[PDB]
Amino acid sequence: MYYLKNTNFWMFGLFFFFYFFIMGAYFPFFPIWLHDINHISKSDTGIIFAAISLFSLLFQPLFGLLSDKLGLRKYLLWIITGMLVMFAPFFIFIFGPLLQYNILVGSIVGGIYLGFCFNAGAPAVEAFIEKVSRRSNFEFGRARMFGCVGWALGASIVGIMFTINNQFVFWLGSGCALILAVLLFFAKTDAPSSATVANAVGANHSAFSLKLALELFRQPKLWFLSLYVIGVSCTYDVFDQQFANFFTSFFATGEQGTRVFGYVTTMGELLNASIMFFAPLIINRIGGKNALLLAGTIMSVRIIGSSFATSALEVVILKTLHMFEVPFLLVGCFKYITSQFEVRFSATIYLVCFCFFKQLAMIFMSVLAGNMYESIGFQGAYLVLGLVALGFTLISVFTLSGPGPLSLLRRQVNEVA
Numbered sequence: 001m002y003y004l005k006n007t008n009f010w011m012f013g014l015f016f017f018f019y020f021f022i023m024g025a026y027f028p029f030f031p032i033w034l035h036d037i038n039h040i041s042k043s044d045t046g047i048i049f050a051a052i053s054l055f056s057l058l059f060q061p062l063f064g065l066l067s068d069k070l071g072l073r074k075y076l077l078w079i080i081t082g083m084l085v086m087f088a089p090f091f092i093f094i095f096g097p098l099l100q101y102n103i104l105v106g107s108i109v110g111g112i113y114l115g116f117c118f119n120a121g122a123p124a125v126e127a128f129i130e131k132v133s134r135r136s137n138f139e140f141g142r143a144r145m146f147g148c149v150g151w152a153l154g155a156s157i158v159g160i161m162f163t164i165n166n167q168f169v170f171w172l173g174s175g176c177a178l179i180l181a182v183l184l185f186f187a188k189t190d191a192p193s194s195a196t197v198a199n200a201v202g203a204n205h206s207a208f209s210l211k212l213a214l215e216l217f218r219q220p221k222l223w224f225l226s227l228y229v230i231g232v233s234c235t236y237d238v239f240d241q242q243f244a245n246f247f248t249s250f251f252a253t254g255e256q257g258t259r260v261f262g263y264v265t266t267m268g269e270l271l272n273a274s275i276m277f278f279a280p281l282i283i284n285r286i287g288g289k290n291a292l293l294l295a296g297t298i299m300s301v302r303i304i305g306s307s308f309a310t311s312a313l314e315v316v317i318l319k320t321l322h323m324f325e326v327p328f329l330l331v332g333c334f335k336y337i338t339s340q341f342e343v344r345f346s347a348t349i350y351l352v353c354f355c356f357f358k359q360l361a362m363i364f365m366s367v368l369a370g371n372m373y374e375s376i377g378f379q380g381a382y383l384v385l386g387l388v389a390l391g392f393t394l395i396s397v398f399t400l401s402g403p404g405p406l407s408l409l410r411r412q413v414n415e416v417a
């Protein structure tokens with residue numbers, strides 16, 4: 001219909017679709033790539049990943065602030081497709097070497113740029129396309145749902161095709177990407193048609209600063225939210241970032257190990273939907289403060305649930321749990337801010353609580369972990385994380401902010417209205 005007939009919807013609705021392919025392959029492929037293909041150790045991964053964060057810390061913000069000065073100008077988005085496109089050449093020829101010839105520290109730092117095109121770029125493409133939705137009429141609401149397919153599909157084809165010829169996967173990741181990427185730029189949207197002239201008129205913006213900041217640190221709830229996020233995402237994320245290779249110990253063969261993974265991730269998002277569809281009700285019904293906990297608990301159990309694991313089928317069950325925590329954390333982390341936080345603070349919150357304060361820890365924990373793995377084995381270290389994990393989730397229960405602060409209904413009218 002009008003949301004399926006128009007130029008831009010189709011065009012970008014695709015752009016979404018083919019982002020995930022490349023992301024798809026990229027993410028899982030990565031750990032596995034390193035292993036089977038780059039005989040990578042923990043020290044190396046640990047840093048590889050961790051490092052990545054640094055640029056997920058120092059690259060993305062400047063990159064989102066540039067999104068405004070740019071307004072709805074495609075300039076930067078191209079700077080994305082550009083670097084994405086040499087995905088195959090870059091990876092095969094750059095990391096491989098810097099790494100394989102025996103020179104790790106540089107292959108990481110120096111590789112976490114075409115590599116940045118998938119952390120910031122996400123909120124990137126997720127953003128721009130969003131402003132284009134306000135210009136045409138149909139919400140990124142159905143654009144992400146359309147683009148998410150590519151994620152499902154790719155992953156599957158990833159495992160399969162991967163082991164058969166990883167050299168290949170990149171080819172089709174970066175190929176369909178580029179070709180279609182550029183294909184989708186020649187057809188765009190430039191000027192208004194009743195949708196206001198100035199870029200500062202339709203999407204509007206938000207702001208942050210020292211006082212805002214200086215005020216947040218004054219608050220105690222930041223301290224107690226951060227602990228949560230920081231403690232628990234750091235932990236959990238580090239875990240999931242190298243959890244794969246472990247999953248891959250459990251199979252008849254490496255070739256089939258990999259496969260299952262693609263299946264899972266893929267079969268996952270279909271669980272993602274089912275959940276989130278209820279997420280809001282569930283949450284509201286429940287409560288921010290709770291949403292998170294339940295989320296963190298799960299995670300804990302998904303970790304501790306790995307030091308006591310032996311079967312491959314038993315790992316299947318442990319992954320799944322990933323998708324149980326997604327919705328709830330996103331949703332909760334989101335509605336808990338809005339619920340115990342003055343709206344003028346969101347932007348600052350993310351910036352300070354999730355961009356300068358999350359990403360930071362990972363750079364450290366990751367390495368800690370990597371090391372713990374090499375020097376103590378997967379499951380062994382886990383008791384450390386998962387424990388710490390649950391230990392921090394527990395404290396949050398007994399210490400996060402009131403499920404119903406000193407005026408829940410009044411502000412719960414604030415979220416509704």
Ligand SMILES: OC[C@H]1O[C@@H](S[C@@H]2O[C@H](CO)[C@H](O)[C@H](O)[C@H]2O)[C@H](O)[C@@H](O)[C@H]1O
Pocket residue numbers: 023237326
């Ligand atoms: O990274 C691709 C996936 O991103 C998440 S949202 C994203 O998740 C990472 C962990 O991978 C961090 O928590 C970030 O802060 C967060 O923004 C989506 O939900 C998935 O479907 C993938 O698109």
